[PDB]
Ligand binder design. Structure first.
Ligand SMILES: C=C1CS[C@H]([C@H](NC(=O)/C(=N/OC)c2csc(N)n2)C(=O)O)N=C1C(=O)O
Length: 260
């Protein structure tokens, strides 16, 4: 298709490897580019962790209000919210919002621990029908994004399907889904990624990720006014371990999708 030709040209211009999956919920049509290749998820994996804790809260009614200690030894790099509460506590709701809206890495580690380890996050993915997602490590090493490494990867096709089930479908209870949607719409890290390529009248909830090899990721649910919502995954990674981030590639992929 012509959208695929434009995505391939964007990828050729970028020097890296681009993965795109679009679901148009109006007719369940999809656009895939490298849609079955694995990509390092980096922080886009935090959506699965927050969702798995929300699922637990369907039976543990007050789980989101449970305090969790933030100790000095817990603090890993890029933890701007948790660092403010060292030697104090944050609730699981606050940790979920921090992991999702600021990509706080310590917050993610608290979600992983609540689930019993990385295997607990993968377990939730399998429980909702995602056979592809795998979380293998904690923060910060899950972002090493080593070429070919299957650890901490998924495919664009699988992550788009999962993000649809979590936000627009019924993988979660009604109030849990609404809470996840609120958190994603309130993300603070996404202005230069998918959001930057879309008409500004469209409502967007998204979660970014970044890692070594210039890995630059974003997954989004998109509400245009007057049409059914879309789900868009944009994954990007590069050959050089010290490559710069390329959020412009993600914005440009979104702009191409919105044109088609
Ligand atoms: C705003 C950030 C950066 S901190 C967070 C996290 N990424 C890393 O900690 C990371 N970034 O490297 C550029 C890393 C860890 S180890 C390694 N080699 N690299 C993540 O992706 O969850 N996410 C976002 C985001 O884009 O949302």
């Amino acid at each position: 298709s012509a959208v695929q030709q434009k995505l391939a040209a964007l990828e050729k211009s970028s020097g890296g490897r681009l993965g795109v999956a679009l679901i148009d919920t109006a007719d369940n049509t999809q656009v895939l580019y490298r849609g079955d290749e694995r990509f390092p998820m980096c922080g886009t994996s935090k959506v699965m962790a927050a969702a798995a804790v929300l699922k637990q809260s369907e039976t543990q009614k007050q789980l989101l209000n449970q305090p969790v200690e933030i100790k000095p030894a817990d603090l890993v790099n890029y933890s701007p919210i948790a660092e403010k509460h060292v030697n104090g506590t944050m609730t699981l709701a606050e940790l979920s919002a921090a992991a999702l809206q600021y990509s706080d890495n310590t917050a993610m580690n608290k979600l992983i621990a609540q689930l019993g380890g990385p295997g607990g996050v993968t377990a939730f993915a399998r429980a909702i029908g995602d056979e592809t997602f795998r979380l293998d490590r904690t923060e910060p090493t899950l972002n090493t994004a080593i070429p070919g490494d299957p650890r901490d990867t998924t495919t664009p096709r699988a992550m788009a399907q999962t993000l649809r089930q979590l936000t627009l479908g019924h993988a979660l209870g009604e109030t849990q889904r609404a809470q996840l949607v609120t958190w994603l719409k309130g993300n603070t890290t996404g202005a230069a990624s998918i959001r930057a390529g879309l008409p500004t009248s469209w409502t967007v909830g998204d979660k970014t990720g970044s890692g070594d090899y210039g890995t630059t990721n974003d997954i989004a649910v998109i509400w245009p006014q007057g049409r059914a919502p879309l789900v868009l995954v944009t994954y990007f990674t590069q050959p050089q371990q010290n490559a710069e981030s390329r959020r412009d590639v993600l914005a440009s992929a979104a702009r191409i999708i919105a044109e088609g």
